[PDB]
Structure formats: structure tokens, C-alpha cells
């Protein structure tokens, strides 16, 4: 399929971008009997999930990647059907709170109660999406059923994880690779499939345009390769996500025009972005950082922007409707820049 | 088997004369009983003030032996929805008295947890069958009750327990359990009670447990502070002196040493400093605002949790910045 899973390191020894983390994983996998619950935190796209899969292969042998996708039904306190997908595999379970909202407590409760009845490893992607109640059940579920189950959850920015869960887990950090290592991985990819590659500098450009993201860099490489007729050019344009371009245009409009009509246009742009199912926290983050790369703003304007960004992202974290906080942040930026 | 019970449910008053503190309410309800007329009572006050004990003793005094069938007690533990009020309460307050004459007593313990529809149905039962039935309503929050229900109920306010009632109850407990209490420990116990008898009884039981040999051993203020884990007044005064007079490094060192000497909690120190600073005389009125606001958000953040050392440094900085306004 895509080049992201085409060159995904299946084994522990095939991971060659952290070194120290690989040695620590080998240390953990030396004696799996005393393996505690693991929590992996780091930048998105670093490869924490790849490390988890490699560790599971190092423990249970090859075969962890034999995923079967199943359909499960759950009932809340009231009569309701919850069609939750389960991607289980030998000695491995996958749960993600992306599809399920506030009902995320009962699904994980039933799943962990059924699986917990050697041990079976359970992987929870995006551990930050829990609503502080599934965490309340999970802490006791893993504290009492530690003999027949092990929990390995990956996440980024583990601040919304409650203190008891973080106390009940081993904290493992997965730093993003340097630009040279991403360039080396891209060089290996283009050695496996020749892409002409006129200059080595474009690989560094792709690495720098991803901010330490392997998945984004590989997607960029594949996009340029397919668009440039199975070739590459030194002057080939850098391809970026559409919502990044939309946010940059929104930043340009905010800097240029500061008025109520411009505020309504910004609200329409934010509504389009929300309708495209982009989370509002990262929308605020990208908008704030795109405002800070504007070279026509002084230091006082940047400080005001970052202060309003902190206030409004805290408000959005403690809020219900995301449009209010985004509109407030944009209006505060407009009232500060004028 | 009263020796096999917690001290809170061991010294529950059985007669009206055994209830201390609320002398006015006790005298008023006793006059009501002796005159033979009892209105629809409503008891309001903080927890542990003695409302349930008072109403239970009153019902026992009115019906000495017929308490089982002359008294219907419902609380939050039982369902008190619209159907229960419509059926069970009406059936109880619709039949004649068995042989005791007088009236039927219905006690609604913790009526603030009842739904609004239940109170709306209950008001007509109260004002309809009042010839042979009287209602008593106990609640800690009056905002959760319908204004009509408050209108048809005679309100009695249960004040927090004064000093003398606490002294008398503690003396009775000491006589019963053959225990000794220092006057300093007595003063410490009343201060931490906060007008609550249950807290006093629990702390006294924990202090008796703390002693290696209960008899021939007095309970001092050190025993109280060790059992309940509260800071001593001297520790609070030293911490406040270090924060107010000394520089930042030594104030932080003093706070850390005081907290690590006995494992004290930062919230208890915050409450102690708040209580001490209330007695202070501030001539700026901005120091008061800064202190109250900063300590309120710090206490709230502690309630939500977080970094403890950061919160302590925040307390020190807030106090210093607030007292910088007094110049």
C-alpha cells in the first residue's frame, strides 16, 4: 500500500532512529514476566506505536501483526447500541476512544472485564481522549487484574492523564528523530525504490518541513514522487496539508484586515475547519504559531498573542462549544494588533 | 451492645434533655409538647448540629411506646418520588390513630434531596391532613426546598454547637470512658470541631486509640495533632513569621522543614494562615483583597491537585506580594 506501512520496522532490531530507546525496550523484553504497565509519550508520528508492535513481537514472537477486525456491540445505562470496532491479534488487543465519545467508559469497562477473565497485552491508542471516568475504572482494572492483563497506551502531551494512572505506569519517552535520521530513512526508502533523487537537499527539506514526523515526511515523499512522474526535482514545491494552507490564509487575513466583517469571515473559515473534523485545540495551536511567524509583528504583539492563546486553550479545554473560544481568540488578536 | 459501636452512634441522645447547644429550640418544642399543640416543624442547620437526634427524642417523648406505628420516617436512603409521596405518605396520613390519639408524626430526613414534584404533592398533604398529622422537615440546604413548603412549615434554625455544649458533651464522654483530657487538648479539639459533635467524637475515639494504655494516660494537644494530622499553632505562627519577615530562600526552607517534620498538608497550613490573618489589622484594604483572592485560587488548585511545591511557593509569593501593598 502506502510507503508508510511499506517500510515500517516489524522487529525490535529493525528500529534505527532512537538507539537508547531500542536498548531500553530490549531491557524490558529481556524478562517479560515482570513487565509493568507501559505509557509511551512523545511527539506525534515519532514511531511509538511501531516501538510497541516491535516490543510485542519481541515478547510473543512474530504473529502480532495478524490483525483480525471484529465488530462489537455495547449497551450504556439506557437502551443503546454501540458498534465499536475491535482490531484484536494473538496476545494483543487494540482500543481507541476516537469513535466513541463520552460513552468511552462502558466500552473499555466491558472489554477489559471480558479480556482479563502468561498475560494478554492490551494497547490503548490516544490515551488522552478518555473523559476521566474510563480512567477511574482503568486504574482499578489494572491494579487488581495485573496478573492476567498488561496495559500499554501511547499518547502525546500526557497532561490530561490523571495522576493515579501515571503513578500506576512506567513512563517511557519517545523523542522525535533529528533531520539527519529522517533523511537517512528517506534515503533507504528511495534506495528500495529508485526515485531519481537529483539532490540530497530535498530530503532535508522534507525532513525540516515535517518537524520530526516520519509519517508526514513519508506522505510528502510519496506525493512528490507520484506528482513528479516517478522523479524528484531540486526546485519541486513543498507539499503541505490543505488545512495548513487554510490556516495560513486565515492568519494572513487576520493580519491584513481587522474588522467585524473580517471576524465573520474568520468564523466561517473556522466553521469549515470544524466541519472537516479537525480538533479545535490543534486549530488554535496552528493558528497561534502561524501568527508568530508573521514578520510584521513586534514582540509585544507576539507576547499578547501567546498569552491569549494560553488563556483561550485553557478555556477550550474547560469548555463545551469550541467556536466560542476560537472566535474569542481571533477577536482578541484583532483587538491587539490594531 | 452499645460498647460495639462507633462513638458517633454511641452517644446519640435518647431524651430531649440530653441534647446540648440548641437550648432555644429544645425549650420551644418542649413547650409545644406540654401545651399539646405541635406545628409543622422545619429543622435547618449545618451537619452534626443535632437535628435528627432532637426530632427522634421528641418523637420518643411524645409516643413513649407507640413509636413504631405513630412515626413514619423517610430519608434519602429510601425512594421518595412522586409515587411514594402520592401513595405511602397519603395512606399513612389518611387513617385514624390506633389508640394513642394525639397526632401522627411524619419525619422527612434530608428533604433537600427530594424532587420538586414530590414537594409540590407533599404541600397539599401537609395542609390537608394537618388535623391528625404533623410533618417535620430536616434539611441542610434551604435553597433546594420549594418556597411554599417553607411557607407552610415552621422554621427552626440549628446553630453550630457553642463552646459550652462541646465542653459538657466531652465531659460526659470522658466520664463514661474513664479518660483524661488536658485543657490545651480540650481547646484544640473544640477549634477543629467547627461546631460539629461528630468530629469531636471521632477525634476523641482516635485519641483514645492513639494512647498505648488508655487509662492512667492523659490526652494532650500533641496527641490530638498527631492523630488528626493537623499543624500546631506554633508551627503556623513560625511559618507566617518566616514568610512575612525572612527572605525567599529561608522562608521556603522553613516551610519545607515544617511540612516534612510531621507530614503536614499544605491545605491545613493555608486554612491556619487564613484564620490567623483574619485577626490581623490591615490599613490598605488591597492587601485583604489580594490575600483572599490569591489564597482562594491556590486552595481551589490544591482541591484539583497538582504540583505541591509549586503551590507552596505560590502561597509564599502571594502572601509576600499582598503584604507589599501595606508598604
Amino acid at each position: 500500500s502506502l510507503w508508510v506501512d511499506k517500510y515500517r520496522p516489524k522487529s525490535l532490531n529493525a528500529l534505527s532512529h532512537n538507539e537508547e530507546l531500542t536498548n531500553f525496550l530490549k531491557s524490558l523484553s529481556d524478562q517479560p514476566r515482570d513487565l509493568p504497565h507501559l505509557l509511551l509519550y512523545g511527539p506525534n508520528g515519532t514511531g511509538k506505536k511501531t516501538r510497541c508492535m516491535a516490543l510485542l513481537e519481541s515478547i510473543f514472537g512474530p504473529g502480532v501483526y495478524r490483525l483480525k477486525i471484529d465488530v462489537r456491540q455495547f449497551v450504556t445505562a439506557s437502551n443503546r447500541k454501540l458498534e465499536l470496532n475491535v482490531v484484536s491479534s494473538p496476545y494483543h488487543l487494540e482500543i481507541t476512544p476516537s469513535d466513541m465519545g463520552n460513552n468511552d467508559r462502558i466500552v473499555i469497562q466491558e472489554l477489559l472485564k471480558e479480556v482479563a477473565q502468561r498475560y494478554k497485552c492490551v494497547i490503548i491508542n490516544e490515551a488522552n481522549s478518555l473523559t476521566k471516568d474510563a480512567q477511574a475504572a482503568l486504574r482499578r482494572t489494572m491494579e487488581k487484574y495485573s496478573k492476567n492483563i498488561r496495559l500499554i497506551m501511547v499518547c502525546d502531551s500526557m497532561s490530561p492523564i490523571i495522576a493515579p494512572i501515571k503513578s500506576r505506569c512506567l513512563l517511557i519517552r519517545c523523542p522525535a528523530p533529528s533531520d539527519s535520521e529522517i533523511s537517512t530513512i528517506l534515503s533507504d526508502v528511495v534506495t528500495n525504490e529508485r526515485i531519481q533523487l537529483e539532490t540530497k537537499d530535498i530530503l532535508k527539506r522534507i525532513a525540516q518541513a515535517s518537524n520530526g514526523n516520519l509519517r508526514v515526511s513519508l506522505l510528502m515523499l510519496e506525493s512528490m514522487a507520484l506528482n513528479n512522474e516517478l522523479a524528484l526535482k531540486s526546485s519541486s514545491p513543498i507539499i503541505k496539508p490543505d488545512w495548513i494552507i487554510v490556516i495560513h490564509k486565515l492568519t494572513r487575513k487576520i493580519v491584513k484586515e481587522r474588522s467585524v466583517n473580517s471576524l465573520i469571515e474568520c468564523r466561517a473559515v473556522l466553521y469549515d475547519l470544524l466541519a472537516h473534523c479537525i480538533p479545535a485545540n490543534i486549530i488554535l495551536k496552528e493558528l497561534t504559531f502561524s501568527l508568530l511567524d508573521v514578520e510584521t509583528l513586534n514582540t509585544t504583539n507576539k507576547s499578547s498573542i501567546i498569552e491569549y492563546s494560553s488563556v483561550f486553550d485553557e478555556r477550550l479545554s474547560l469548555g463545551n462549544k469550541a467556536i466560542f473560544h476560537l472566535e474569542g481568540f481571533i477577536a482578541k488578536v484583532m483587538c491587539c494588533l490594531d | 451492645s452499645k460498647e460495639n459501636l462507633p462513638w458517633v452512634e454511641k452517644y446519640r441522645p435518647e431524651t430531649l434533655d440530653e441534647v446540648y447547644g440548641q437550648n432555644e429550640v429544645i425549650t420551644t418544642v418542649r413547650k409545644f409538647v406540654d401545651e399539646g399543640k405541635l406545628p409543622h416543624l422545619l429543622f435547618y442547620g449545618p451537619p452534626g448540629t443535632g437535628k435528627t437526634s432532637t426530632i427522634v427524642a421528641l418523637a420518643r417523648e411524645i409516643y413513649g411506646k407507640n413509636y413504631s406505628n405513630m412515626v413514619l420516617e423517610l430519608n434519602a436512603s429510601d425512594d421518595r418520588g412522586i409515587d411514594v409521596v402520592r401513595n405511602q405518605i397519603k395512606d399513612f396520613a389518611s387513617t385514624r390513630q390506633i389508640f394513642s390519639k394525639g397526632f401522627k408524626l411524619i419525619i422527612l430526613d434530608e428533604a433537600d434531596a427530594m424532587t420538586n414534584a414530590a414537594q409540590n404533592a407533599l404541600r397539599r398533604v401537609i395542609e390537608r391532613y394537618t388535623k391528625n398529622t404533623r410533618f417535620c422537615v430536616l434539611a441542610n440546604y434551604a435553597h433546594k426546598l420549594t418556597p411554599a413548603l417553607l411557607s407552610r412549615c415552621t422554621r427552626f434554625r440549628f446553630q453550630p454547637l457553642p463552646q459550652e455544649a462541646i465542653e459538657r458533651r466531652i465531659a460526659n464522654v470522658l466520664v463514661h470512658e474513664k479518660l483524661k483530657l488536658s485543657p490545651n487538648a480540650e481547646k484544640a479539639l473544640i477549634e477543629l470541631s467547627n461546631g460539629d459533635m461528630r468530629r469531636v467524637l471521632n477525634v476523641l475515639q482516635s485519641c483514645k486509640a492513639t494512647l498505648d494504655n488508655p487509662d492512667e494516660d492523659e490526652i494532650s494537644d500533641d496527641v490530638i495533632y498527631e492523630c488528626c494530622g493537623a499543624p500546631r499553632p506554633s508551627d503556623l505562627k513560625a511559618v507566617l513569621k518566616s514568610i512575612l519577615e525572612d527572605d525567599w530562600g529561608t522562608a521556603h526552607y522553613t516551610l519545607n522543614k515544617v511540612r516534612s517534620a510531621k507530614g503536614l498538608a499544605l491545605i491545613d497550613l493555608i486554612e491556619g494562615i487564613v484564620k490567623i490573618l483574619e485577626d490581623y489589622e490591615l490599613q490598605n484594604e488591597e492587601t485583604r483583597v489580594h490575600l483572599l483572592t490569591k489564597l482562594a485560587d491556590i486552595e481551589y488548585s490544591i482541591s484539583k491537585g497538582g504540583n505541591d511545591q509549586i503551590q507552596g511557593s505560590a502561597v509564599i509569593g502571594a502572601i509576600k506580594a499582598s503584604f507589599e501593598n501595606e508598604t
Binding site: 476516537s98 490543505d242 478555556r315 | -
Partner: protein, 439 residues
């Protein structure tokens, strides 16, 4: 001995308090519905209470039914309180409809559903929906005309729970009928308005002169004019106006004249919060009465979204950015109070104060609109379906677990681009998920 609104009921079409245009386009619809091949199957009338909805249908049936009836006069009104022995309650309306379907030729009679069955119970409400859906979709060659009158009233709060539905908040045609019934080719809807001051004054004057002796005996004849004007100004309900006039006339003292208070509409409340209300220059009193009388509408997240959407229409967006920033900051602060009444009070008070401070004469405001959040939710649902399809095809043709977060961030745009060149240069999903992002 009889009520005035009952003893002075209209006897013909000319005595019905209704606008000429309303009479015309109800007459045309009813006449078209009596044709052998009528495009419209049923007639839906919506409006506030006492808007001559029921009576005008009666006076029209007095002149239309006797004309179209075959040779071999009134309506066949559904009566919900009839309890038949061998009839379950949900089957009563079905039996009524089946019996009334036999009213086509030589038995023609208009069907007037003024009081609907119990729609506050969900089972019979769905039964009503699927029963009137079958009437519109019936294969019957000809059916009797059906007229449904629904009174648009706000249901007051009864029980405390956040599972409140549309029927629980307000009693309107939108909450009762679903989208299929309302948007049907064989359904004609004629919304009604409250009776204007002119017809109310004319009919009150007619009622007064019909009892001239009784007002002249009580010396109230000279004071009847101001009473008529004030009653017509206060309310638009003909029944309430006639009842109040009868109460005033039969009185013998100086009791003040009082009428029922109509609820304030959603856009009416939005305009009151934004532009203020005339005859009330005190913002505190207006806000207090709005919260006391229309707490159901105010205590909703839809109202705050409406304020956020429509606050830019005060002067077509021609006001200082500081005021807009203050309004949106206050709304964001209110969003963090977990729906407390203090949040709504503070938000409305701040919006009203901000718009009052900058208010000037000669302002040309804009048109307010409903919030577009439901459209955003529908687009998000479509994006969710497309992302589920992408994750299913990516987990069926091969083994690759990607998170929905990564689908929205990168795989929603990069993967369609990969599938595009891969396909044209030569998987299933080729377009950007959720459509392209514009502006």
C-alpha cells in the same frame, strides 16, 4: 348566562377575525383540495392560540362541503377522550382515520384534527407520524380532505432531566411532524399570525354594541373605547380579548384589566437581547422579565450560539472591534460555567450593555439568522462515515491500523492524492475526505 366568545361566535365568513389574504389563500387551498384529483392531500394550519384557525375551517366547511357533496355539511372532528372498550389508546387514532376514510362520495365530510392524540408519549407520537405518513402515501384513488390545526405553544418545564426533546421544550408542528411529513408534495402548510389590532378593535366594538344596554346601565359605555384599544394593543388572541372584555363589562369596580401573556419567540428574544425593547429603557427589568417568562428558551446552548451568530448584525458589522471582542470573550467565559443560570444572566447582560453603550440613532441593522452548527454537525457526520469507509478499506485489503486523528490530519488529504496519481498514472477512495477545504 353564556360566555361572550361562545354566544357571539361568527355565523358566516364575514364575521371571522382573519386577514383578507389569509382568507383568500385558505379558501383557494381548501377549494383545490376538494377536487377529484387534488395535488395537496392534507392541509396543515399552524399558529398561536386564538388565531381563528378552527372557526374559519368550520365556516368554510359550511359552504364547501354542501357544494362538493354528491346526491343520494360540517366537519368530522377527532375526539381523543373517547375511550372505547375494545380499543387500545394508540389504536384510537388509527380507527378514527380508517372510519373517516369512508367519506368520499355521497358521504363527503371535511376532517378536522384540532386536538391531536397524546403526542407527549413517544410510542403514540411515532404511531401518529407513521399513520399520517400512510395517508399522504396512500394508493387510494380519492380521499376526503384532511385539515390538521396545531397550536404553536411553549411547553413549560415539568421534570428535571437533560434528555429534554423537541416536543418537551415547545409544542409546534416542527416538533410533532418529522421532515418527511412537513416536506411532502401532497402537504400544504398555511402558517397563521395573531389577530391584528384593527380586526380586534372592530370585533370588540361589535360585541360592545351588541350589549349596548348592559354597558349603558353600568355607565361603562363612555369608557368602552379606551378599554377596546388597550385590549387590542395588549394581546392578539380573539378569545382572550373577548373573555377579558366580558370580565371588564360584568365587573362593578376598578379592577385592572389583565390578559394572558404570550411567549417571546426565539428571534424575538435575540432582537430583544441585541437591540433592546421599546417602552422599557431599564435593561435590568427587561432581562429579568425575559428570564422569568421565557426561561426555557434562554437556558439553552442554542440561544448563546444565536447571539454569537447574530451580534454582528447590529450595524451591518459597523462597530468597534473592542465591543465584538468583549462580547465573544464574555460568551467564552459563560461557556465554562457548565450551564449555570448566572452564566446566561451575565452573558445576556454584557451583550445588552455593550450594544446599549454603542447604540446611536439612524442605525441600519441587518437580518439575523439561525446558527449553522447543525450543518457543521452533519458535515462532521459525513466525514465520520467517509473516514470509517477509509479505515475499513485500509483494514481489509491490507493490515494497517490508522487512527481517526491521523485520518483527519494527514490521511484525509495526502491519501486521496496518493490514490489519484496511483490510479491515473496506472484505491477506491480518490476524493478528499469530507470535500476540499476552501478559504
Amino acid at each position: 348566562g353564556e360566555q361572550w366568545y361562545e354566544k357571539f361566535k361568527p355565523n358566516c365568513l364575514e364575521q371571522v377575525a382573519i386577514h383578507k389574504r389569509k382568507l383568500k389563500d385558505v379558501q383557494e387551498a381548501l377549494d383545490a383540495m376538494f377536487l377529484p384529483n387534488a395535488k395537496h392531500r392534507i392541509l396543515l394550519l399552524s399558529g398561536p392560540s386564538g388565531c381563528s384557525k378552527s372557526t374559519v375551517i368550520k365556516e368554510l366547511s359550511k359552504i364547501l362541503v354542501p357544494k362538493y357533496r354528491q346526491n343520494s355539511h360540517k366537519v368530522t372532528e377527532f375526539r381523543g377522550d373517547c375511550i372505547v372498550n375494545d380499543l387500545p389508546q394508540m389504536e384510537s387514532f388509527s380507527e378514527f382515520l380508517k372510519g373517516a376514510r369512508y367519506l368520499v362520495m355521497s358521504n363527503l365530510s371535511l376532517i378536522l384534527i384540532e386536538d391531536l392524540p397524546n403526542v407527549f408519549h413517544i410510542d403514540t407520537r411515532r404511531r401518529f407520524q407513521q399513520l399520517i405518513l400512510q395517508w399522504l402515501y396512500s394508493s387510494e384513488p380519492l380521499l376526503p380532505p384532511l385539515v390538521i390545526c396545531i397550536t404553536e405553544c411553549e411547553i413549560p418545564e415539568n421534570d428535571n432531566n437533560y434528555r429534554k426533546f423537541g416536543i418537551d421544550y415547545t409544542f409546534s408542528a416542527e416538533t410533532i411532524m418529522n421532515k418527511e411529513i412537513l416536506m411532502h408534495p401532497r402537504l400544504k402548510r398555511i402558517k397563521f399570525n395573531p389577530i391584528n389590532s384593527t380586526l380586534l378593535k372592530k370585533h370588540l366594538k361589535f360585541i360592545c354594541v351588541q350589549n349596548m344596554k348592559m354597558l349603558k346601565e353600568k355607565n361603562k359605555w363612555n369608557k368602552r373605547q379606551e378599554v377596546i384599544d388597550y385590549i387590542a394593543q395588549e394581546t392578539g388572541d380573539i378569545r382572550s380579548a373577548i373573555t377579558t372584555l366580558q370580565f371588564w363589562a360584568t365587573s362593578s369596580g376598578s379592577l385592572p384589566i389583565s390578559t394572558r401573556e404570550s411567549t417571546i419567540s426565539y428571534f424575538h428574544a435575540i432582537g430583544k437581547v441585541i437591540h433592546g425593547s421599546h417602552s422599557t429603557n431599564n435593561d435590568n427589568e427587561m432581562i429579568n422579565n425575559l428570564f422569568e417568562n421565557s426561561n426555557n428558551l434562554l437556558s439553552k446552548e442554542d440561544f448563546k450560539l444565536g447571539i454569537l451568530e447574530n451580534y454582528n448584525t447590529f450595524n451591518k458589522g459597523e462597530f468597534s472591534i473592542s465591543d465584538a471582542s468583549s462580547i465573544v470573550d464574555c460568551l467564552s467565559e459563560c461557556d465554562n460555567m457548565n450551564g449555570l443560570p448566572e452564566s446566561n444572566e451575565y452573558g445576556l447582560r454584557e451583550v445588552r450593555k455593550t450594544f446599549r453603550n454603542i447604540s446611536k440613532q439612524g442605525h441600519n441593522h441587518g437580518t439575523v439568522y439561525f446558527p449553522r452548527e447543525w450543518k457543521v454537525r452533519k458535515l462532521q457526520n459525513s466525514f465520520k462515515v467517509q473516514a470509517e469507509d477509509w479505515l475499513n478499506v485500509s483494514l481489509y485489503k491490507y493490515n494497517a491500523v490508522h487512527s481517526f486523528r491521523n485520518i483527519t490530519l494527514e490521511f484525509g488529504y495526502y491519501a486521496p492524492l496518493i490514490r489519484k496519481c496511483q490510479s491515473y498514472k496506472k484505491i477506491d477512495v480518490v476524493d478528499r475526505i469530507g470535500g476540499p477545504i476552501e478559504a
